[PDB]
Structure 1
Amino acid sequence: XXXXXXXXXXXXXXXXXXXXXXXXXXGYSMFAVGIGALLFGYWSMMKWNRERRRLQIEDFEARIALMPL
């Protein structure tokens, strides 16, 4: 009996298949989150600066109140 190297292909490994595809981001939907984070960013920040004004006037009031200084 002769024994040589046997042939096997099975699945053929798929000859040239695309793996690159669009994922997560679509296009217009990313701008809704992108610019949406900006509008949420300013509104949250400016409310803190209005709360800073409560401290600001109260800080300068200490100088006016102190005349024996």
Structure 2
Amino acid sequence: KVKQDMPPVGGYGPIDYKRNLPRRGLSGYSMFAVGIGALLFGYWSMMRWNRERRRLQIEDFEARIALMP
């Protein structure tokens, strides 16, 4: 008969050993640019809302002071 030992048609195809750890492109300083940007949004909006809340504050004190007598 023939022999049943293993090796097949040669090569088993290619195999990739070498190291790969790629792909993060979002990082220049521009990460700072987007974060600091987010701050620049927060202070804008929050500024507005605190102004509004002061307006309400004066209005409430007006309620009280009109009550006082």
TM tier relative to shorter chain: 0.7 to 0.9
4+ long deviations beyond 3 Å? none
Percent sequence identity is 62
Partner of residue 9, structure 1: 12
Structure 1 residue runs without a partner (length 5+): none
Aligned length: 66
What TM-score, normalized by structure 2, do the two folds share?
0.79
SS at match of 2:61: helix
- RMSD of Structure 2 on Structure 1 (CA): 1.7
What TM-score, normalized by structure 1, do the two folds share?
0.79
Structure 2 residue runs without a partner (length 5+): none
